[PDB]
Design an enzyme around this catalytic site. Sequence first.
Site, PDB file in Angstrom:
ATOM      1  N   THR A 177      91.895  49.714  56.064  1.00 52.66           N
ATOM      2  CA  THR A 177      91.215  50.796  55.510  1.00 52.66           C
ATOM      3  C   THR A 177      89.807  50.243  54.824  1.00 52.66           C
ATOM      4  OG1 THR A 177      92.138  50.835  53.503  1.00 52.66           O
ATOM      5  CG2 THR A 177      92.576  52.883  55.076  1.00 52.66           C
ATOM      6  N   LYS A 190      86.014  51.058  55.155  1.00 50.01           N
ATOM      7  CA  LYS A 190      84.856  50.884  54.139  1.00 50.01           C
ATOM      8  C   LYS A 190      83.582  50.181  54.429  1.00 50.01           C
ATOM      9  CE  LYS A 190      88.860  51.232  50.935  1.00 50.01           C
ATOM     10  NZ  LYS A 190      89.618  50.296  50.003  1.00 50.01           N
ATOM     11  N   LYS A 210      97.332  38.163  57.857  1.00 48.17           N
ATOM     12  CA  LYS A 210      95.875  38.566  57.647  1.00 48.17           C
ATOM     13  C   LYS A 210      94.746  37.614  58.100  1.00 48.17           C
ATOM     14  CE  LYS A 210      96.800  42.451  54.216  1.00 48.17           C
ATOM     15  NZ  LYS A 210      95.977  43.606  54.720  1.00 48.17           N
ATOM     16  N   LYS A 268      90.726  41.677  50.645  1.00 42.09           N
ATOM     17  CA  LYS A 268      92.215  42.163  51.256  1.00 42.09           C
ATOM     18  C   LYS A 268      93.327  41.293  50.576  1.00 42.09           C
ATOM     19  CE  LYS A 268      91.233  42.075  55.519  1.00 42.09           C
ATOM     20  NZ  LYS A 268      91.662  43.404  55.909  1.00 42.09           N
ATOM     21  N   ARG A 269      94.393  41.866  50.583  1.00 39.99           N
ATOM     22  CA  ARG A 269      95.513  41.125  49.694  1.00 39.99           C
ATOM     23  C   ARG A 269      95.617  39.788  50.739  1.00 39.99           C
ATOM     24  NH1 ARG A 269      99.346  43.464  46.127  1.00 39.99           N
ATOM     25  NH2 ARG A 269     100.141  40.956  46.492  1.00 39.99           N
ATOM     26  N   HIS A 286     103.850  52.600  57.401  1.00 34.62           N
ATOM     27  CA  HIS A 286     102.482  51.775  57.319  1.00 34.62           C
ATOM     28  C   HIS A 286     102.773  50.375  57.652  1.00 34.62           C
ATOM     29  CE1 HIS A 286     101.145  54.659  54.595  1.00 34.62           C
ATOM     30  NE2 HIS A 286     102.418  54.805  54.159  1.00 34.62           N
TER      31      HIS A 286
END
EC number: 2.4.1.1
Lengths: 813, 813
Positions: free
Chosen positions: A654, A658, A552, A546-547, A355
């Site tokens: 992911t 969505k 990120k 998202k976290r 992952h």
Amino acid sequence: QEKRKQISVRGLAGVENVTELKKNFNRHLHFTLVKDRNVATPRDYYFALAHTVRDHLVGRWIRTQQHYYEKDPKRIYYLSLEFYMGRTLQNTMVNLALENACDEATYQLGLDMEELEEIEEDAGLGNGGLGRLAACFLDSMATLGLAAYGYGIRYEFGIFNQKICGGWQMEEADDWLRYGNPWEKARPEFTLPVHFYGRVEHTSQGAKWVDTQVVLAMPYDTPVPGYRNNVVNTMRLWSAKAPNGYIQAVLDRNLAENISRVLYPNDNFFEGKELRLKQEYFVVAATLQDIIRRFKSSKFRTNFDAFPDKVAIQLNDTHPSLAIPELMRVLVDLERLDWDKAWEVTVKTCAYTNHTVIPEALERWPVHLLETLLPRHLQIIYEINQRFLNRVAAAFPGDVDRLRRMSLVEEGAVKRINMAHLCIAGSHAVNGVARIHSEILKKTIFKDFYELEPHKFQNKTNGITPRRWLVLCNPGLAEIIAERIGEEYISDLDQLRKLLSYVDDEAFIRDVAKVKQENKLKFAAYLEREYKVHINPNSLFDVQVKRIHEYKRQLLNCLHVITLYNRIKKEPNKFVVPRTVMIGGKAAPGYHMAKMIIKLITAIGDVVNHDPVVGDRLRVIFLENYRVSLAEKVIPAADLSEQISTAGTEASGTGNMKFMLNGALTIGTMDGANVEMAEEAGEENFFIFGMRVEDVDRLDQRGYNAQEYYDRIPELRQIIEQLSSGFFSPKQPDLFKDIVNMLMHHDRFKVFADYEEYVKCQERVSALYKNPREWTRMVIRNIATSGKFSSDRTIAQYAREIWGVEPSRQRLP
Amino acid sequence: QEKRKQISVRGLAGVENVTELKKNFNRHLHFTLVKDRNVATPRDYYFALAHTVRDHLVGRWIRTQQHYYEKDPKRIYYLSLEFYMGRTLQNTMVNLALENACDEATYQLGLDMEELEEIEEDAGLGNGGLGRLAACFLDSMATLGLAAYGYGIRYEFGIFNQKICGGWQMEEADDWLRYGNPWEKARPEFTLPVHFYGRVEHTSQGAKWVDTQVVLAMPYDTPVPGYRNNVVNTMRLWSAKAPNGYIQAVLDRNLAENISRVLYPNDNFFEGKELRLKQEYFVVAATLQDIIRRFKSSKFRTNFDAFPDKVAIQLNDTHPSLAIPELMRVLVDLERLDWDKAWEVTVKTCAYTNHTVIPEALERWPVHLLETLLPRHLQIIYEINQRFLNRVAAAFPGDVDRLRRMSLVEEGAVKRINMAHLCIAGSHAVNGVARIHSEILKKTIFKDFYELEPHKFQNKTNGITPRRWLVLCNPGLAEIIAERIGEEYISDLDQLRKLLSYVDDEAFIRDVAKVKQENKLKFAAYLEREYKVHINPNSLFDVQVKRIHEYKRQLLNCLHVITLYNRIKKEPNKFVVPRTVMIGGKAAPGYHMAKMIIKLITAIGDVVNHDPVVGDRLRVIFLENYRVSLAEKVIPAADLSEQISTAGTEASGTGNMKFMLNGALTIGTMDGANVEMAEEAGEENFFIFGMRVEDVDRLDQRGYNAQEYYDRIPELRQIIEQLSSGFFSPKQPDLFKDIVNMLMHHDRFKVFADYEEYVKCQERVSALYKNPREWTRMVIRNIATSGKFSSDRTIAQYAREIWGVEPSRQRLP
Ligand SMILES: O=C(Nc1ccc(Oc2ccc(C(=O)O)c(C(=O)O)c2)c(NC(=O)c2cccc([N+](=O)[O-])c2)c1)c1cccc([N+](=O)[O-])c1
Ligand SMILES: O=C(Nc1ccc(Oc2ccc(C(=O)O)c(C(=O)O)c2)c(NC(=O)c2cccc([N+](=O)[O-])c2)c1)c1cccc([N+](=O)[O-])c1
């Protein structure tokens, strides 16, 4: 009611069925809840509805599992420390076609079902995408008629509930079982013992692991309804129990039982706590005995050769990689198979999913830790290594460095075990989670491994289920689609492609834009109601959920936001497309920067949301306590989806998918499955910006120098100065000094290297938005080519190229 | 089946009812237990039956409590730290008349109901007679149609399960909720906060108790079915929950929640642990807010004068005596009533029951303890004392010593609060539990108190319910009685007197002796089956069951046993009535002598049960894990009941009464309610032996000298020598040296002073036994005059002379 009615994808509200439904509800409220309508509380209403729903499952559940018993297929176990399940009531009504009946039923009892639904606790048993992946996968394997079982830990407390306080996160205990759980079923009949500590004695039988401490694993089964096919599969979660002065010994029962107490809330990050390794040993040892016990009660030395014909064990990450040395433990010590047969068996049962490429995500356990907790496992891991390394030697004669590199044993001050190495050694297949990621593993991280045994390595691009992530959460969108192309797409999402026929259909164009604006008003009412947050429903909804992490680049988003603000103040009369910029997600407690960054977000809104010149042109909100259920609300309402991580650091993602399913346009980098989503749709229909992976690498080759960008870009210099000087936090000028210093001198994620292009790309996005029709037609293009990102697709591939089983969509009786 | 059938006191097995019963069982097994007959385990069977039983309660429960709501009677709360409830399934079928239907139902599903019943865990929420008193009382108040509520703590772990190991007790955790509890109902709607620690600030409002720690009290209601009258009352038990680094704070939630973890297992004994006082504060503070909250939601400065018209609070012992200063706390601080009105109110709400004269049973809390945990309560206790002592002064001018004696404040090295003094001060009534006990309190312990306020003091002789303790446990006896006199006696036990008409009835004589021998064979099969213990069913069953203590003189019993044995060996050819001597009961962990004494018992059987000369003439067994459910088995099988405590130390006893109800003859002392039982029956029909209280006191006046008895009694000298020298424990000769030294130099209970008469009285008992007919006719005399020892009698008295409410036996709809 009329909309809820109208929606055909929600089934029939048959006269007898609504008569029975309402009947079972009254009856539950009387017998189960011990109530009358005078004394019932809403929570009783909820529980009364939930018991009635669940009664529709039981017969299917009983019979599906009888069918596996009877037929004895090959069995799939999905071993994970995380199942990000979220709520269950709507979900089960969905897959049972009961939603519109239950809707009519409750209305008629003078109860709004949506309201009851909001009483349910999420099962927040995960941290972010792997955990949620795990839950999407249970659903698809059900829908695909597979003989699949989820196996995990019944935590007491899931991911912490987030409270924003003074603009900071405050963690509270997620006590999701306070009021009990109508969904689960205790399985005392299948309680097993798990052994901790002790020591190893080599005798004439062989080895024997003695003087251990015992914790019992108590299983709780949960039904996993497939889509409308009369399959119900199980997730089995283990909970820790103590074996069967005086007061202080009873009180100290908590110590053994603290093994299932709490999800560790570190997403994308190895902290090497012993309690964490007990969690990992717990689920592994209980699951594999339960597994070996089923194998034993099924067909028929005959037996164990065929064990890989009868068992698949999928490792979600390296979190259950102790599966490998445990399987061997059992086979060798308990079953007395020879080491080489036992190793053949293991490698044929086990496959591993990666992952993350980030090195700080890798599990590398100190051996002393393992040596104390798990003396025998360590010995087996040493034997595994030795013989694996004898294989590398044989294939690369003289390549000494390669030996050191591939070893499961990390040398150093602290010896440690590389759990990834472990997993590649003991699995027949090793996958990544998206086309680019799986190339980089082969090209980088697991390069020497790939050379050894190139046939091990695969790709399995992620998906999301189009039940939770369209039909449940966006019943509107679901309904205008079914109107054109009927309902088959729901478990054949590739059917979406049919919607390209509508790109120039005025009613379709109109309806799509109608549905989104419908969702924007709903979301906006949710914010008023639940949080008294007032937002502009006639603005662009720009969402990053998202976290919170550095990779990120929530921080690059914040720079865009302060640019927007600073431009307005410069030219105040100049028109701009109105935005609502929503950033949501949790920080790991103890991730200092991530907590800093939440604080900066809300700090930006303290300024931005109070400038009268700005007015309703720009608004910045931090969405509190992002979770599956919150996803299900804000995703169907977003216009733009932010997928802005540095190229090469998001393995797949992911959330991207969505937001695509539900009619947002994507600004992103070519990272993870963003690349395949641009491919699906055509790049003409995405907002791709900034470095490709090759440009990051060239940057690293010569040196990232943040000051180069600072010196060249007057706009980025205006903001840095804002941050330093204390514009965003006047009562504490020095507040954001560690953000600034990181950005200036230690940014591993190159935020400034993507700044100029992100802002120009954001220009493009707002230009398109100023033409609604053309926004809506590109959106059409996005929805229409998202069927590849269904998890049915992903899972059918795991079945055919890993588990060695055929999927199915033939209905059970 | 045929016996179970035959028994009319067990109701009708109506055709439709058995058809419905069986239907609800299948349905429960399908929906609730998620099962089929292929996969159900016995435990599922149990739970399937239990859910079906409980469904018969719900409507009554709902409506009884609606009736209290509607009618608003005066309410009775029975505050206790203990409810020795034992099992519930049989019990509820009893009081609902469902037992024979459920019997027929299950048979027909191919299931033995008795077998299912043995799966149920006891709710062992007590230590011995006060705890069990508490449970008998819930039942009678239900049966008497009173608006009564039990209020206690839902422990995690009740009294430890006892395992005898090597002839020693081993405590194991009583995890009675492992598998969940079909009987209880969670009441989240009524969760309350309880405050610990903090400090007090005197402001212009008054006092204010600040900076406290909060634990939540979560209530769980349990139904209390009355006998066949359509009343179902509630017991409400509170369970501790934590309020709503990061991991270590969640783990540490256990600390607040350890308040309801475990029953303290010290019966008849004050150990002054802070966790114990938190337990006591917990139940008190939650119950009284719940109480004051009901009062507030019912009728109508109007309010609180009438509070004692609307509320009775019965204190079972001094364990919830914090009720007093808490009530005042609320009234004064929260409600702002004046101190003197608030005190008037308290004294009118509260009454106290005493269970013990033993000084080592009294709660005397160090003030520093109270000062830390409960700063405000301490202040109020000081104010209470001052003003109470101003009242003593006024009534006894100059009597300074009396001041010191009556004070709630014990001086010393450690200051402490006398919780008994507390209770007499703040209650309108103070009772003992049997005629003699209540005289001694007035004559001794609470003598100065009695002089002050002689109208405070009462007697309420104990009872036992004749549902659990005859109808449930001895359905045989129950049936031969109903055969003669019909069924009314079951809630009018005074009807038993009618059986004196049968003392010379040959069929009655025959049937009584038949039933007991029937019970002896059953018990004897239980011992084989469950414990592989083989006993003679053609012997006298001589039973001493009760917690192990010095006052209780299990040790005097052991001397009788070793006398019996030694006599046989002396004259081996001489005939003796065969006995099985059964001693059962738990020791408090940490009570060293009591644990010593268990060990001596089993040591006696190691010798005794292996002498071939003895053979089947004498057998000594220790009955493991004595509990309510075990009581229910061995009591109906006993011939002789041992009630041998020193005169003046057993306040009442209730085991005496159970053995009387069920057709054992009693050897005892004139102690507790043994005296009233001799009165009932006539002393010609009891085996009364040894000191009266006046002879103990005369002994104490001059000096107990154990050696005097030793020197005079060659038989007692033979045994002492046995014990010393190591006859009973050859592998460790010195094993019983602390028994011997206690007997020789520190016996507070004068065992040797009662030795010669106990053995001669035991001669009498066996002489009577050698004539069966005459045994059986005296037994008749015993059963026939036990109706006074019904708890309906006891409770109707509490209602009329304490709670100031009328009982009832008119059926609800
Ligand atoms: O085989 C029969 N029935 C059955 C048989 C088996 C199972 O499920 C099952 C039992 C045991 C095992 C195992 O050994 O691991 C497996 C398996 O191999 O995976 C599956 C059934 N269904 C359930 O037991 C069930 C399913 C879902 C949920 C629960 N639960 O919560 O407890 C229970 C019903 C059968 C055959 C013939 C006749 C009858 N009958 O008339 O009752 C029944
Ligand atoms: O008053 C009415 N109903 C009712 C009303 C009241 C209660 O019980 C009750 C509620 C609240 C309180 C209180 O304020 O403390 C008390 C009391 O004063 O002691 C008693 C009922 N029964 C229950 O609530 C009940 C009983 C037993 C067990 C449970 N449980 O486990 O939750 C619940 C049903 C009523 C009146 C008119 C119409 C209707 N109706 O049609 O539904 C109902």
